[PDB]
Amino acid sequence: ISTIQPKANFDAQQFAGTWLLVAVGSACRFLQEQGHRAEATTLHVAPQGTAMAVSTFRKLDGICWQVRQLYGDTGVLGRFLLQARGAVHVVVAETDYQSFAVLYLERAGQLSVKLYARSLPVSDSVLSGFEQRVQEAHLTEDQIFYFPKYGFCEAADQFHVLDEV
Amino acid sequence: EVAHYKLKPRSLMLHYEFLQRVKRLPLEYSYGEYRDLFRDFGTHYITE
Amino acid sequence: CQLSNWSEWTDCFPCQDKKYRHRSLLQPNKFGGTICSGDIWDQASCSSSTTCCGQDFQCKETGRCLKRHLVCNGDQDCLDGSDEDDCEDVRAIDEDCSQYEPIPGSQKAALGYNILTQEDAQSVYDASYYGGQCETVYNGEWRELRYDSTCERLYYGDDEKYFRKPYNFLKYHFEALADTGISSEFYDN
Amino acid sequence: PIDCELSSWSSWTTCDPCQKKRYRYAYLLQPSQFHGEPCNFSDKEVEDCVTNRPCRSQVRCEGFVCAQTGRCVNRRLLCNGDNDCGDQSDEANCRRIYKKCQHEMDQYWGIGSLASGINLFTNSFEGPVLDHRYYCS
Amino acid sequence: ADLMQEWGDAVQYNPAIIKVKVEPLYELVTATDFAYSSTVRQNMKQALEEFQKEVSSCHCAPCQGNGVPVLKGSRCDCICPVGSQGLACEVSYRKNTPIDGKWNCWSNWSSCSGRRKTRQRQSGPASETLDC
Amino acid sequence: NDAPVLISQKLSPIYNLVPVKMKNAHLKKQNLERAIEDYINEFSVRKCH
Amino acid sequence: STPFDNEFYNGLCNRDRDGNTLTYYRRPWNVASLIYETKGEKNFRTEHY
Amino acid sequence: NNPEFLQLAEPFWKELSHLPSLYDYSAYRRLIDQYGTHYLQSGSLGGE
Amino acid sequence: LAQNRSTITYRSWGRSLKYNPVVIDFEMQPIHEVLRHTSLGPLEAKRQNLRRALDQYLMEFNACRCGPCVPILEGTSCRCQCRLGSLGAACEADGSWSCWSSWSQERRRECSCPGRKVQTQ
Amino acid sequence: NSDERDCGRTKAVCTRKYNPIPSVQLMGNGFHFLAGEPRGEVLDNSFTGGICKTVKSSRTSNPYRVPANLENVGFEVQTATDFYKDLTSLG
Amino acid sequence: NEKKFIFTRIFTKVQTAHFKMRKDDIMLDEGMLQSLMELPDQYNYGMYAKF
Amino acid sequence: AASGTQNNVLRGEPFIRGAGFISGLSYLELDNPAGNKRRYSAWAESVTNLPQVIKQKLTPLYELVKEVPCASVKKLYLKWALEEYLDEFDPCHCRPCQNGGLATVEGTHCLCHCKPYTFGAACEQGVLVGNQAGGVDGGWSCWSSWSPCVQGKKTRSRECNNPPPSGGGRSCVGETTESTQCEDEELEHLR
Amino acid sequence: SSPVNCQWDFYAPWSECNGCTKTQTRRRSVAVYGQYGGQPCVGNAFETQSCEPTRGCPTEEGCGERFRCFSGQCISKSLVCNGDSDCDEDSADEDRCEDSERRPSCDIDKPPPNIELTGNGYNELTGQFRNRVINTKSFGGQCRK
């Protein structure tokens, strides 16, 4: 169990829009055995009160799917909660409002990092900072996995949607 | 067609309910219980 | 509504300790006849009780005949609980069987049926009786949904894929068939 | 008009020494239709007898005889973490656990239907005739 | 539809039996598990013969509207093509409907004088023979 | 699904629901039967104009 | 409303595994059995003179 | 590699062992029907 | 699903059918037949008594003795609940089956009327 | 794994686990000149002789593991060409 | 005189699975077993109708 | 008087052989003759992820009998049984099928596997499109009585029969006679 | 067209029996095959009747210095307690192999996807594949990564 300082004065309104997941550094079974089958993962952020409405588009067997979740607030600005065995703690520590975004997730005493960007390509300095942070997070370089830079879903359908909320 | 299936030609293990029902089968010819067995477990089994 | 007279009082029962009588329904309300609030059945208290399986074991209040191999096995076979009582020094195996739930829909299969009203009667078969047997049938709905944000993993929910079969059920016959037919008739004269 | 009618009761058969019971039966002559009166009674009868004749009821077993199902399971399948001798007769009085695989694998998809009896005359599936249990390559 | 990839990759999770190679049930009963194997197998053969004679489904009354009779215990229900209602499907919105011919119950075998069966289409084969 | 309401309702008399082997179970049951009969036959559209 | 108590239960819990979502309810001993068969229908008809 | 002590299968080896010493076409026909007529020598897995 | 007959609804309709499947059909046998297949052994007397009681019940509470209009006899009230006409209280060739006559033994019926009108014991 | 059966102590020959060279098994197969399909495997391409020799590919930082049977490995990837065009018109 | 009658009805059934009840060694509910034990050997229409 | 007749008999039967991705390109048939590019790539990946064992090379199965009780005797008897199996239901017994159809033997019944764009009882109807050269090819007859082992050779001598080359097609390819060394209990069963 | 019904001649002469399950092998040949969807056949091909045993039945093959399996496939003792599918048919032996030495399978997880299909047989005149004959799932202890 670890906890760091989130982004100072995080604004969900200025953070809204379409985000694109680039790299995720962690030690998970799907990341190490099925990491070669990863695809383009995009994110959609929509503010809802203190919480954050979250939509995720990703190609599963070619057909796109919509993952709708609601990151419940933990009472502290910057930190969020998500529920399904396990508790997810979303922590945003270092990000701007125009080019990149870094997220921290915790589950079952395991830490994980996520790199989000508004568009491709990603700046080399952002990737260097992400590598430095994932190395400071007691994670090795081999646990870093890059994602394709194309094939992002435009929009899903009523049938292809997730209903965690 | 999605998958191929084949049962072993010999040395197979039978179900315990079918085991007990066959142990309950008589020796003298009685079409009633044999017809009940046919109605409860079918007339054949799946080899392929 | 025309109802006959009350029948003669039947003999008192030792265990029930009640009286009974009934009558017949001669003429119901066809068009405008006056209805009869009174029913054809009745009961009465009695005070003439006199005296109130033979197999390996029997429940205390219910006459369910149970073998001794089902006593102290981690499964309540009697509603009163006479099978899992005083089982102090008895090991109870789990078999990885009590974690999974029985087949959905046994309630309707355990109910009776009345062809006159097309309604469901009380429980007929015991939908919770297993008799120590643990049979599992592979379900077909093991593809619903599951997501993992921390691992970025999308796959089918692998929590519950097993259906337990009660003793009173022969087989659940997991299969799949579909026949859809629409009929259309357009005539003009 | 074609209401179900069953033939007369067959002649009494000799009392089976092994099953200590005598049996009689009847067969269908005309099936019911058009919501007619069906044959709503048992097509067979069972009566108790007094068996006086030698019978080879029990069958020998080389391996260990299971306590509940009475199966002739070899000792090589005992104390292997598997439930082979039936409901709860296996895995009793075991010092150590072995022979179990690591990842706790599942069974084949749809193998349950492949182990049940089939009626080729009506294309309907019936009770399970094959023992598709676990019993690891 | 175009979303049939769902059906394609989901049939893998719940497949149905397409082709069947049958084997008689008395061959499944072995002597190592049940005593008196020969007598049990002979009785099973005779019972299967009498059962096939009983559940041939030809004894049911012929349906109408090109229906297919189906035997189930003591009840017989007519499965009709789409477009017909009612028991035996005598009411339909069409005239001079082409009725597919169906075969009746085949006659019993002759007592060793030369086995031959008769069959009337009142479209299966007939004139089956077995040497005595 | 959150809040349902009755559609079809099977009928059953109240005097059949009285607890058995009570103080005056049978007599009170017959009395409530007579009472419900007199209630349903006392005032209705049949007696009005 | 209910003229009787419907919360009392006699002995071992009787499972009520049915419904839209994955949730397990209880059936009181006072109720013999309750099914979740959710039938539905509607009709339409027009005519002209 | 075809010429070697190829580990045979349980059903195949069992059926081959249950074959009678004297020439009997009955079991030979059933074994040929169940197992086929030829085994793999070479060849890729090209689609179609 | 009743509102629309498009492909948009059938998807979640089948999904919910997977969630909660109703009974599509079922074969039936009289309740006195299950007593023969009990572990208690011979119950021939009780079985015959219950069979006679069921034969009398299927005649006392049959749909024919109920008020003519589909006639549904429930308890002591007679209803058809409509023909979907909304003409009157009971929602009034026509066709109607008469009730079974008393066991002579013969059993006659009267009024096209489909089915049998003569029964013999 | 016969050599490492009961070794009480081992000497680290390579500091880090490296990936093997892709398509390295095709470099060990035999060639039957008569058949037009070269042959099955004759040489082993997983043996490394203990020496953890490697090579750094272009923009492929993760090093590849060179087997002992390969003396020299070089990356000279480059294309090498036929072109034909014909047009007919009649009016 | 013009008449146009058109009835287009569809009955579609999609079965999830089949179920088959056992014929021998059936364990009845405790309520039904009590009711059966509570039936007298003499013919009584009231108790049998209640059952 | 105005009379008009329209007939558009268009049909297809794709053969796509990945278990799940089979349905896509095959069901895309409605109003889309050409298959989708992305769907084709997905099916290619899927059929790479699942084998397509067809297109094999074969060798005599009886050679696998190496270390079993009565190995060589059973091997020779399996050779004889395989020869008897091959010549007992050889499709030569079946009559030639119309329109160049290919006959097979399933148990005790001949089945004329119809060529593409053909159907019927004996592949006689549906001659709308042939798309081939045409004619009637030749077919080898059934093997005659085996040689009495005078000097070990064979005298089967497969010859032409009731389906001769008539429509200008090529004759049945293959040898006329065969020759080997008779077993004669295989030298009294190996010494 | 003219339909053709099947008709078989008398069965071949009798054969010997030496399998302790005496049965006179009486094979027959269908001289006239069915065609045009006619009568396939009615009578069975083979016939099993009583027989007289002349030669003794063959005993099981000698299992020399090889640990036997549940089925009978005798393999070398080099695979004893190898922590993998040693017998390649069942886990009967299992060598009480709790202390698994040499790090079994050296952390190698999967074989080729469906090598079981490669193990399957082949039929030529029917175009349909057959059952698994060659146990390609073997390893011989020699892990080939």
Ligand SMILES: *[C@@H]1O[C@H](CO)[C@@H](O)[C@H](O)[C@H]1NC(C)=O
């Ligand atoms: C079903 O809904 C769609 C979308 O609203 C509509 O276009 C269609 O007409 C509807 N079907 C009907 C009304 O039969």
